[PDB]
A paper describes a structure:
Transthyretin (TTR) is one of three plasma proteins that is responsible for the distribution of thyroid hormones (THs) in the blood of vertebrates. TTRs are homo-tetramers, assembled from subunits of around 127 residues that have a β-barrel structure formed by two four-stranded β-sheets. The four subunits come together as a dimer of dimers to form a central channel, which contains the TH binding sites.
Of this series, the dichloro derivative VCP-6 was found to have the greatest affinity, five times that of T4. The structure of hTTR in complex with VCP-6 was solved in the I222 space group with one TTR protomer in the asymmetric unit. Ser17 interacts directly with VCP-6 and displays dual side chain occupancies with 38% occupancy orientating the side chain towards VCP-6 and 62% with it oriented away from the ligand, forming an intramolecular polar interaction with its corresponding Ser117 in the B domain. In the co-crystallized hTTR complex, VCP-6 binds in the forward mode, with the dichlorophenyl ring bound deep within the channel center. The 3′,5′-chlorine atoms make contacts with four polar atoms in domains A and A’; the backbone carbonyl of Ser117 (O…Cl 3.3/3.2 Å); the backbone carbonyl of Ala108 (O…Cl 3.7/4.2 Å), and the amide nitrogens of Thr119 (N…Cl 3.9/3.9 Å) and Leu110 (N…Cl 3.8/4.0 Å) forming favorable halogen-bonding interactions. The 2-carboxylate group is coplanar with the aminophenyl ring (−70) and one oxygen atom forms an intramolecular hydrogen bond with the amine bridge (2.65 Å), which stabilizes the conformation of the diphenylamine ring system, while the other oxygen atom forms an intermolecular hydrogen bond (2.7 Å) with the Nζ of Lys15. A comparison of the crystal structure of the hTTR:tafamidis complex with the VCP-6 complex reveals that tafamidis also binds in a forward mode in the same position along the channel with the dichlorophenyl rings overlapping in the half-occupancy models for refinement.
Residue numbers in the entry:
A (entry chain A), B (entry chain A), C (entry chain A), D (entry chain A): 10 to 125
The structure:
């Protein structure tokens, strides 16, 4: 689909499974509106968040609930969640992958944006 | 001081200088309230955000305006900003350093928390 | 296969395509011996490096030729290559993914190790 | 001095203290020669590796013994060490900082290169 999220675990060397991911879109009135959400699969990936028809240009926030993930693994972590804010631009046909690599006191995120 | 932010640039191999950093605290009514802010120095570090008296337990967000930083370097980047949300807990005397390593489509952040 | 490498580009937000990857194994005499090698595909992934029969316990080094990759993109980077050294242990059936996220002056690497 | 190394711990949110760091230089015969080495201080930093007189252009490898560091903290990690290979070039007066952020299955490294 146009938007995928993948989450990896740097402490156990594994995909981060069953992580809640929320996508919000900035609405015309400058509030965050719920856009899509889901939980990562056993490969750490979350597919099927949205469709080409629903995913329009705008400012999006991807919120990953890293706190609940770590607690389910027996870890009480530093961050409340990991979040990523970015603009989706139509200049071409695009697909976005937001990936995050998690540790208890750190995270990395990157975006892969490709043209089909 | 109890809270320091440092920002590095992975494209030029340099501290990220003159980056705007905003700290917000969650208020009793669950909105973000401006708490402190500043701009990184030539070493990439932002000192003097707050004092021991002002920095209480709570939920804080550190927002780094990476978009303006990249544009001043001639780069139009992916993220709108980089932000870090975490709980400050009194269990002991603590000092927090929030560091971020920036690229145009990615960033890393980590926290260093030490007891003086 | 038991060993996969994936390489991402943090400057362009894209898989790192056609990157040379060399795998070495430490031999009984403590030299590095060429074990397997290949180039990443259009998805940034390198499959088919080795087989279950050939991939034994040992100490492996994965060397990614990031210098040639950046130069082909018009960038003269800091590192000569990115390399990752680790032990493969038989304690169970295992599959290893070595991933790397590249910038001109920085890189991240992580390992995903799963049991089929 | 012209070359500094700093090491941070993403699992405990702390500088990585007492970590052994080895610097090697490629000699005329294409072997690695020991150049300098030391152990990180309580701030995670290793100062005083070398002098302006000794630090010449060349190809250097910085090897961080992350395995012993994790084991002293009670963790049996994935990597044998973290290493960083790069060219030092005289085009100007330069100072190099090699920083590494460590987790049990991942690490990040970046370089900060500045002109005094
Ligand atoms: O992108 C992937 O599909 C992938 C798969 C396995 C491991 C890592 C992956 N990316 C990755 C994402 C971040 Cl944020 C950092 C790093 Cl070192 C790799
Ligand atoms: O923390 C420091 O003081 C520092 C100084 C120079 C370079 C890097 C530093 N940290 C660092 C921070 C992140 Cl987020 C990632 C990485 Cl590899 C290093």
């Amino acid at each position: 689909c146009p938007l995928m999220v993948k989450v990896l675990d740097a402490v156990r060397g594994s995909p981060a499974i069953n992580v809640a991911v929320h996508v919000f879109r900035k609405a015309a009135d400058d509030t965050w509106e719920p856009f899509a959400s889901g939980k990562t699969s056993e490969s750490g990936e979350l597919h099927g968040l949205t469709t080409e028809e629903e995913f329009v240009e705008g400012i999006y926030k991807v919120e990953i609930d890293t706190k609940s993930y770590w607690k389910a693994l027996g870890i009480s972590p530093f961050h409340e969640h990991a979040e990523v804010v970015f603009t989706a631009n139509d200049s071409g046909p695009r697909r976005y992958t937001i990936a995050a690599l998690l540790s208890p006191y750190s995270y990395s995120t990157t975006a892969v944006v490709t043209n089909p």
